[PDB]
Amino acid sequence: NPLVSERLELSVLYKEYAEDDNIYQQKIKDLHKKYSYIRKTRPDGNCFYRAFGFSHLEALLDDSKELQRFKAVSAKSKEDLVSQGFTEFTIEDFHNTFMDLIEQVEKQTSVADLLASFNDQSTSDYLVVYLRLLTSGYLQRESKFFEHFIEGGRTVKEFCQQEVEPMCKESDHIHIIALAQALSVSIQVEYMDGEGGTTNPHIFPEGSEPKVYLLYRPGHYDILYK
Q1: Segment Ubiquitin-conjugating enzyme E2 binding: which positions?
Q2: CATH number of 1-41+186-226
C-alpha cells in the first residue's frame, strides 16, 4: 500500500475492477492507445495533491528553466499566504519541506531517490498539507470567481476550511483549477468515470500545454506516462 508506487504497466488497472465491469475494461483498453505506464498513489483522500506533487517535481528534473520558475513561485508562496492571513508559525514547517523537495530536484536527484522521499509519510504529507494551503489561499483570493462552483450556502472560506485544507478530503475540479493557477502549472486529467471506452481528457487551465498527466477514477488520482 505505498504512498507512490513504482512505474507499473497500465494493465494493473484491470485488478481494480470486477470481471463484469465491462465499461471500465473498455476504457482501460482505450487508455493503452494513449499511455504506456501508471504510478498508483495510495487511495487515502490525498491522491490529487500527492500525484500532482510527485509528477510535477519528477518532470522538473528535465526542465531547468521551469524548475527555477517553480522554485521562485514556491519560495514566494509562503509570504503570500502569510500576508493573506495564514499563520506563519503554523505553515513554515510545511513550506520548508516543500522547498526541500524542490532542492532535491535542483540537485538532480534520481527518480528513485525522489520516490523514496514521497514514500516517507511525514515528508509526503507535509507536501500535501502545503499544496492544500496553496489551493485554499488561491480560492479565497479569487473568491468572487469561485463562488458559483460552491453549492449549498457555504462561503468560499467555509468550503476551503471543510473541503480543501483538511487532510483526506479528495479533490475535484475546484481544487485542480485553483492549484494550477496558484503555481502557474498545467495539468491534464483523464477522467475514467465517459461515453464508451472514452476517457475524457480535461486540461487545467484550458489552452495550456500539460507536463503532468493524471488518471481520475472515483476515489483515485494516479500518475500516467505516455
Answers
A1: 86-94, 125-133, 162-169
A2: 3.30.200.60
